[PDB]
């Protein structure tokens, strides 16, 4: 009966932990396991990043005409900018409403942090327009292209420890245009890229998930609001 | 990742346990811990009870104007039936809408158990009207009034052992007006009232919140549905 | 502080006697406080009447391809009844599913009588099927075809007292298709057409909403279930 | 200006038809079209059938433990029928809910003929209890198991004529436990099995989506409700 | 295989169709008209930024003014009370609106006119602009923003829709009833360019995309809605 | 007819008016009458405040794990700010997030008074962070911290006059960590703390949850939006 910060902290993250591991137990088809373990995430997002924050699956777009891969927890603005189509509950985001990739899955190996590496790359490699900005106050030059964090989330690891030296080779291996920045392997513990070091961070244990959602909390903050997108610069394919 | 009927089973039970416990050791507020615990009994029987099945917290009246005490789950009827008075998502329920009544509370002991008997004694004295039902194949007599099951819902239980003698003499000290008919303890097991011997049977874990689930189904099969309200039986309270 | 059931069915009809006043005396603009006010209306019956019964605003078609009137106020059946169509949240039902046919208007007087019973005539000329019923048994005989109830919904009336002489006029002006057996003046009474007399019977005060509610769903229950629609019947208008 | 009940009927195939033609022509990733198409159809169903029946996706199991594969569209009770377990929007549930399973992809060819039969089968292989009814006049026998109808959901077909000569020897390939009883080809007709000719009747044109929802209304109307559930038999595997 | 071309027709394709299986489907002309502007706002709903409502509503001031009912206004929620929703129907004040539009199924002179005093029942309206506090402090009161004025409809009476007829009846209000933008969603969609005082017609090039994104832009030079004086309001609290 | 802007403020406050005075006479258990009273306040502010506010039910937590009394009356922001916890509908916010403090129960009274006094103070003592803030036009100094407002929300008052002496004694015996800023008795008027003055300010009639409600949105004005939250202070309570 006595109130607990670090209770609650707890509590966050071993709902998470519970869900993922409940349905990795029970969900005997695998593409059943996969929705609702995104299911999970997603729900964890959606309800504790602040409201200027959207998390769904989609795809993402640009001006330009080019396709990111599918993603199946995209973190983006809708304050203040419109989807490009959204039909039947399917989606695609324009790239300059973009925060956050991530690739879900149930488990970490090598070829799942290549994976991951290549769909924040297909993101990443997309164009993003930015004009200047009205404002109470006037106008704001175009804001400079925020960042894009990409990311990893898992339940499990084939390595013992999740955070060790084969999960570090594979995420050195890609430190540009596919580094993930922060994950989470929910059994295990949690991992950022440090750009002050340039190094990766590892912690084991101490509530994986929720120190997960926080450090994404404080990284996302640096990004600010996403830039002002140019709708008309993808009218240019209203005649072509 | 090979599907299994006992695997479904057990989840259901796990995930009630698991939040249970969760409610429990986070929240440090009585009321807050209370009122987290009824929310995980009442999504359990909202989700998995055939939809023949409302389940809320109510109070309870009868056309002679009296009522209940509050029942924090009780399971009733809409299809047949109105509300007397719902207003700011507080519930008034007619007599004839009831088919079960539970107390839902933290642990099992001899005033919880009391305090559970008297509440079911509290619905079971009020009165019911059965008017004859018309249907497809022409009228039925009105239908003899139904049995309103009584129950009560823990998580932990004071006794040792948790559904030992000291258990079934707190549930045989009423086996009339406010008679217990099932009931589940989460971390320990189930209980319920067999007619036929005249006697408690009490299974320990066999997947506690599942297989009181399932009971509970099996004995509300035997009930059928709700007697008919005579609605103007309320109605001669509009003139007083 | 103590529980009173006369004060619960005073509340249920004072809530809406308030509601209407507040529509009538702040919305200036006759389609918004029309379209308010039919809002209370679908509202009361929406919460109170039994789930078998659906209350909306639609249009009604048969296998004749005769269409009723705007309906604003329609009770009926889903559980065993198709839409007809039913597009951007307008709607088309079919005859077979039809209990109850309304007309609500802040006032009532000459014109909004005929009106209302010119909209329950163009619901009852319409033709109903109905097939020999398949249920738990075995296959019941087609159930013959049950009344359509007609009524009025309003809260004020042109004259003073409301259900007098005039109102007597206006109701016995058609007691063939365009009948309305029951109705409403919220400020002021209720109605229902005695069958075995063959004249109405005026009830001034007593809680009109209340009073009106609890004769509609006893007036009702008298019809059961509707008969089984045969959707094939409409189906012969596929062809080109 | 003019009300028809033929362009009601039109309108609804067209919205079907037309849906689907986006979702194909739109979406660029084949899960996602997959998704999009899928959602069309479960839209149609929860929108125009019956109230008492549920449409969604699904595994199946019967009390002996056995599995069917995923149905993408299931037609199902819950009035009278628990789920048997839903976690994360994902859901089993019992054989004894089922009335109609279907295949839905984008089009009609021989190996998509024979992997809904295969799914169709999956289904009907399952055990099904039946307990006789309690109800309002008594209690009824144990109903007789109904049929489980099969059926396949597609926009276009491989076939020239769609549903010519090849489509009939792909159905007639299975009558027996893969049988399919309806179904739908939006661009091109529906079919059914006449079992009392023994053939399948095909119709082209004639609204196809609208001739497939008013069939399988009309064949499910001989199913009734479905038997009651022996929950005591899923019971037996709460033991350790 | 994707295409970015593709997306943008799709989602004009559907809005004409939603609209196209209305006009020809409902018989009844509330009706019809009641499900034509639930697809224009269920459109503007799902693809304008969040930072945007849209519904109908009544417009008031606190100078107790009162605009023509909108059935499709764009509005701020994020700054704004509402002055007054009850039994889902909703009046909101002069400071949080944004674009004011009507919709009909067939542009005619007689329609254009109407749309024109429906956004001059808004425009006439007095708008309150506080000083604003913020991160950094508090700025000086925003100067106002133009609201947007525009019609929306299917069809237009005239041949070509947006030809001569079309222009000389927008023509006839260029100041308090101005219309900014509009959309015909079988034909096309117009604006007027202030930079050359004149109407720009696009035929074509997927009417209904070409106007939502012409109306973000258009929209993004607003910013958000001055700050509101709510006790301005508050002078018709007393007796 | 006429639109009236005095009508619209007038049927606002009445309409608040109403449904505390029904709640009030009508639910006869204590707890169930202050859940539908809270009801009221709580959909008064969600239904009229900019949606930059939400309002709810919650404790509030510190990055030193310090945590507030049970607040039935929050205001605060999700737009830049993280729950801390919530789960089965109960919820703890960071006081970063608070912009506002009520204690809301039917009848004001010296000890309520004193209550509400102490409800605020036990969230004002928590200790709130302030970074410095990214934003489109580089990155702000931290943002200064703003009080906290502090309220009472009552329908009815023990005094006649209501906002006379003995009010004023009450609501001045605590002017610093426990101040009342603003308040309501529905029945009877408001008060402001007036701090240029020193002294409250009250106002009697003149539709008093309305004057409340624009005098509530004037003072939330000032406070703009919260501080930006340091989520890592709160980390610290991840491996401890």
Redesign the interface.
């Known amino acids: 009966?006595?109130?607990?910060?670090?209770?609650?902290?707890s509590?966050?993250h071993?709902?998470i932990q519970?869900?993922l591991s409940?349905?990795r137990?029970?969900?005997?088809?695998?593409?059943?396991?996969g929705?609702?373990?995104e299911?999970?995430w997603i729900?964890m997002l959606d309800?504790?990043?602040?409201?200027?924050y959207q998390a769904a699956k989609a795809?993402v777009?640009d001006?330009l005409?080019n396709?990111s891969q599918?993603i199946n927890v995209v973190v983006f603005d809708?304050?203040?900018?419109?989807?490009?189509?959204?039909?039947?509950?399917?989606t695609?985001i324009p790239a300059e409403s973009v925060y956050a990739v991530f690739e879900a899955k149930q488990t970490a190996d090598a070829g799942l942090v290549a994976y991951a590496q290549e769909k924040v790359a297909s993101v990443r490699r997309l164009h993003r327009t930015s004009?200047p900005?009205?404002?109470?106050?006037g106008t704001?030059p175009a804001?400079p292209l925020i960042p894009i964090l990409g990311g990893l989330l898992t339940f499990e690891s084939e390595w013992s420890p999740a955070l060790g030296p084969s999960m570090d080779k594979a995420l050195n291996a890609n430190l540009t245009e596919g580094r993930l920045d922060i994950g989470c392997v929910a059994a295990h513990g949690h991992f950022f890229y440090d750009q002050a070091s340039g190094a990766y961070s590892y912690t084991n244990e101490?509530?994986p998930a929720?120190?997960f959602?926080?450090?994404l909390?404080?990284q996302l903050?640096?990004?600010?609001?996403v830039?002002?997108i140019?709708?008309?610069a993808?009218?240019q394919?209203?005649?072509?």
Chains 1, 2, 3, 4, 6 share one sequence.
């Not at 009966?1 to 902290?9: A, C, G, R």
């Not at 309800?47 to 200027?52: I, Q, V």
């Open positions: 009966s006595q109130w607990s910060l670090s209770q609650l902290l509590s966050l071993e709902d519970q869900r409940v349905v137990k029970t969900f005997g088809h695998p593409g059943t396991k929705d609702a373990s299911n999970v729900d309800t504790y990043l602040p409201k200027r795809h777009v001006s005409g396709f599918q809708r304050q203040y900018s419109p989807f490009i189509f959204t039909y039947e509950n399917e695609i004009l900005i009205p404002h109470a106050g704001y804001k101490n509530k929720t120190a959602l926080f450090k909390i404080a903050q640096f990004s600010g609001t830039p002002m140019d709708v008309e993808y009218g394919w209203l005649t072509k």
